Amino acid sequence: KVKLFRASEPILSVLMWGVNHTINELSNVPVPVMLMPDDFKAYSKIKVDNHLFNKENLPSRFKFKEYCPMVFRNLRERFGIDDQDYQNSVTRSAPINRFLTTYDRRFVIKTVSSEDVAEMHNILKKYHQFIVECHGNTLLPQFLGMYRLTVDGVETYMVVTRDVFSHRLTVHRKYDLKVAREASDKEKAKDLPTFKDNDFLNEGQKLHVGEESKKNFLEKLKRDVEFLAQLKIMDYSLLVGIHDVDRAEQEEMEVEERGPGEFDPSVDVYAMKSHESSPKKEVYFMAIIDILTVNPEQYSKRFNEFMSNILT
C-alpha cells in the first residue's frame, strides 16, 4: 500500500510527494458551498527539512507550494475528476514525458514560467465562472492544479491538465493549429511529428464528424474564443489528433503474434467519432491549448474561421 515515490528525478519524486500531501491535506478540508474571494488569493506552502531519514527516494530538503488549492479542487470537481483518482494517477507511479504525463496517460503536467502562474491568477475567477456556465463543456485546457516545487534551491512551476488525447486510443497523427507556419524539416523527420498549419493545408486532410458532432463542437469553440478574446489573450492553439482504428487493430495484432474505436466521453472529453459515412474509420481529439500568454479580437475571429473550415 506503500507509496515509495520512486522516480528518476528528484523533482518528480517531490512532485509525487507533494500531490499526495496536498490531496490528503485537502481531504480534511470541508467542501464549501461557494468559493470566497480569499480562495483565489490563497496557497499552501510547506518546507520539508529532514535529517538521516527517508532519504532513499526523497530529497532530504525541499518545498511544495500549491496555488489556490480550493479553486483547483473545485475545478477538479467541475471536471468530474475525483481527487483520489487524481492523486493516484500522479503517485501510484512516477509520471513520464518540460512536458510530462502521469503514468496512466490520464493527466498532463507542464512546467511553466512564473509569468504563466501570474497570468493564471489574473484569469482564475473568470475561468471558474466560465467553467460553471458551460458545465465544463469546453475545448480550453482543463486545469486541475498549479504548483511550485522547490528542490536544490530551484523553484519549479507546474500546471496539471487533462491530456487531450485518449488514455486508451493511440494517436496516429498530431497537428498544432493557430502568416505561414510549417513544421521543421527536422521535426518532420521525428517519430510523432507535431505538424503545423501549412503542412495540413498541403496534406488536405479533413475530419469527418457529421453535423451533430460538428454543431456541438463549433458552438463550444465560438463561446471559448469569445471568452478568450474577452481576457485579451493571444498565441493559443488548437491541438488535433487522429486515431485510425484499422491501424490500431493491425498494431494490436502485431503485438499479439510476438471496444475498437470505442471510447468513453466521460474520460476522453475532447474525443469524437467520425461520421458513420466515413472513408477511414477514425477517432479525433481536439482542444485549445497554450492559453497562458495583432488584436485579441482579430485573432479570435481568425482562429474561429480557420477552425470552422476543418470539419464536415
Ligand X SMILES: O=c1[nH]c(=O)c2ncn([C@@H]3O[C@H](COP(=O)(O)OP(=O)(O)OP(=O)(O)O)[C@@H](O)[C@H]3O)c2[nH]1
Ligand Y SMILES: O=c1[nH]c(=O)c2ncn([C@@H]3O[C@H](COP(=O)(O)OP(=O)(O)O)[C@@H](O)[C@H]3O)c2[nH]1
| By the rule CB under 6 A, 66 interacts with ligand Y | no
Q: Return d(Cα 43, Cα 32) in angstroms, integer.
A: 16
Give yes or no for a contact between 40 and 68, defined as CB atoms under 8 angstroms apart: yes
Establish if 122 lies at the interface with ligand X (CB under 6 A).
yes
Q: Which is closer to ligand Y, CB of 220 or CB of 275? A: 220
Contacts of 9 (CB under 8 A, 6+ apart): none
Q: Among residues 23 and 164, whose Cβ is nearest to a copy of itself?
A: 23
Residue 297 corresponds to which cell in the numbers above?
A: 479580437
Which of residues 25 and 152 has its CB atom nearest to a copy of itself in the complex?
25
108 is a site residue for ligand Y (CB under 6 A): yes
CA atoms of 89 and 145, how far apart (whole Å): 13
Say if residues 145 and 87 touch (Cβ distance below 8 Å): no
DSSP 8-state class, residue 2: -
Neighbours of 116 (CB within 10 A): 17
In terms of Cα–Cα distance, which of 281, 79, 297, 263 is closest to 305? 297
Q: Does 110 participate in catalysis according to the annotation?
A: yes
- Report the site for ligand Y in 279-298 (rule: CB under 6 A): 289-290
Which one of a copy of itself, ligand Y, ligand X, none is in contact with 308 (Cβ closer than 5 to 8 A by kind)? none
**CA dihedral sign of residues 171, 176, 180, 184:** negative
Stretch that binds a copy of itself, among 44-52, 109-117, 218-226, 227-235 (CB under 8 A): 44-52
Select which of 235, 246, 264, 301 is catalytic: 235
C-alpha cell at 267: 474520460
Is 49 catalytic? The answer is: no
CA dihedral in degrees (158, 161, 164, 166; nearest 10)? 100
33 binds a copy of itself (CB under 8 A): no
Q: Which is nearer to ligand Y, 142 or 150 (CB)?
A: 142
The site partner of 230 among ligand X, a copy of itself, ligand Y, none (C-beta below 5 to 8 Å per kind) is: none
Catalytic residues: 110, 235
Q: Which residues bind a copy of itself (CB under 8 A)?
A: 1-5, 24-25, 27-30, 38-39, 41-54, 69-70
Q: Which residues bind ligand Y (CB under 6 A)?
A: 99, 108, 110, 161, 163-165, 176, 194, 239, 289-290
